[PDB]
Design a protein around this ligand. Sequence first.
Ligand code: SYH
Ligand code: SYH
Lengths: 305, 305
Amino acid sequence: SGFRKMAFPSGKVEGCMVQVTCGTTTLNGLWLDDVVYCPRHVICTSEDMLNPNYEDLLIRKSNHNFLVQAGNVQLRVIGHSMQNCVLKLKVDTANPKTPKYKFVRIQPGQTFSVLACYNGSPSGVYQCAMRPNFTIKGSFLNGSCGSVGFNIDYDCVSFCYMHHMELPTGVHAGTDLEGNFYGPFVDRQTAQAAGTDTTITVNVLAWLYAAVINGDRWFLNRFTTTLNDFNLVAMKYNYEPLTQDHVDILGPLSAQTGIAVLDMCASLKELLQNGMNGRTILGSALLEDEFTPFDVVRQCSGVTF
Amino acid sequence: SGFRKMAFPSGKVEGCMVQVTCGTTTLNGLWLDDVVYCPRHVICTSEDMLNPNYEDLLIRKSNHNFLVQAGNVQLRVIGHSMQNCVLKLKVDTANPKTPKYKFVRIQPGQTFSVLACYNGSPSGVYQCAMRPNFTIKGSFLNGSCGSVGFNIDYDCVSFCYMHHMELPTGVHAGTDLEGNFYGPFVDRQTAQAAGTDTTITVNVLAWLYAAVINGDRWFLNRFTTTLNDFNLVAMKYNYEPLTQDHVDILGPLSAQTGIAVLDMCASLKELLQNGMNGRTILGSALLEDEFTPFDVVRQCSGVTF
Ligand SMILES: C=C1CCN(C(=O)Cn2nnc3ccccc32)CC1
Ligand SMILES: C=C1CCN(C(=O)Cn2nnc3ccccc32)CC1
């Protein structure tokens, strides 16, 4: 028992990380098979950053200008292409450490692990969620660009995120591995509206179920509610609307604990309206929304990779 | 910017994990060079668990009774020895994936990453602290025994923890890699007092500095205090006493931010006496004590391995 904000084991991703340098700028790349993926802004300079003309900047570059290093081994670049906001550098060697992998574009509210890297070397790993407004609340310093987010299912790494940008608000933005930003963002050093965020309701409910499974039980009450009534409360507190698809994905947790989903919604309603009265749930004094129902079942059942 | 509960990249430890089976019981072992380390209670049965006679149980076992499997490769056991609460199984093959490593016995209040495993396969990685009372608040299911905690410095893994036991209170206990428990605990299925825990004061102060560096600033006040006055408050709220050695290890954070350690203590004093008035610091509504001053500097400076 016990419940922690657990990340996927990072070893399979660590073996894919490389350093990419283009002129003065160094960032991280992801070496899968014979292709290295990295953010296109490796080709910018500081005069470029307010609104880079990436097509014009890239036309000035040749294969031999992209320096790619994997530990101490230098990779030979035999082609380069810009796809959306990522650069794809073809190399003459397939990565011997390539795992089974997929590229996935995740949905807001889903979670993944980030392997933060600098100069192609791993620094740390943590779990986070894609906010409803498509930002992530990460831990990224200058030079972390090209660090990736991922999930693992059995032996397969699903890469879902590559880091590109810290907005002036201090939150983070990035792309899928085809280089398409999540959210309205562009790779320019500018203030960019993120727009209204909300709390991921289905994840809070999943975490309340996690709490019950682990014996934090004090917030269970004698009440129930309806999906309609609950959603009027969710709106008031800037929670995502709960749908029947969410109720369905909470089914396994409802079955395990015996607590109907709408009864758990009534506990959440009371916590939103009354607060946590100085108490804690699973070591937290706020309502946690970075565990999905799948996360809770995986952690509570010991699934391995 | 941003601040997360970050774990070390787990790849170097993943390559050391094996499954050990002795009779009916399977747990995890750590394969370093030509030795596999695992909890001695792999040799027990359920009739054994209230007070196993480990010496008598082990005398019934021979090398060929310890089944050790690394992925699909079976290891040949050529010797076995009990050291404190760990078994050391000599194998005829050195692990080709052995990292540079050390065994360390950590001090209460220090932090480390745990790689939770089942059947020799990694499930997840998370960061935690050794509580002042030598328990850890982990996430461990049955079969996670033999999972290890560790830190990494440059290319060297310092193994500090092997998981053995969940106390009936739901908190966790384990050993260093010489098999000595942290705390008063024994490997018996019994209620065992853990005794009074406290909050790790130097870590809370480190995290308040992390907060300022990241721009959460609202708890800074116009006050200062003395070490004596602060420790009278710490005692009242079951915080560890602050010593000058702690003030010294906070020096780099004090220098970075310009906030004297005793001024930050006065902010902490006010938060202990008044609470956080419905506000948050770094995404938390309580005072966080699982980051050491070294953790904060590492994360804020991008140190890699
Ligand atoms: C053209 C752009 C937009 C601006 N930009 C970034 O913000 C890069 N970045 N990413 N995370 C960071 C964390 C700290 C400092 C900088 C960071 C570079 C690419
Ligand atoms: C003789 C003993 C003492 C009792 N014991 C354990 O508690 C093993 N254990 N460790 N973490 C666990 C989490 C869930 C269930 C069991 C767990 C086995 C060794």
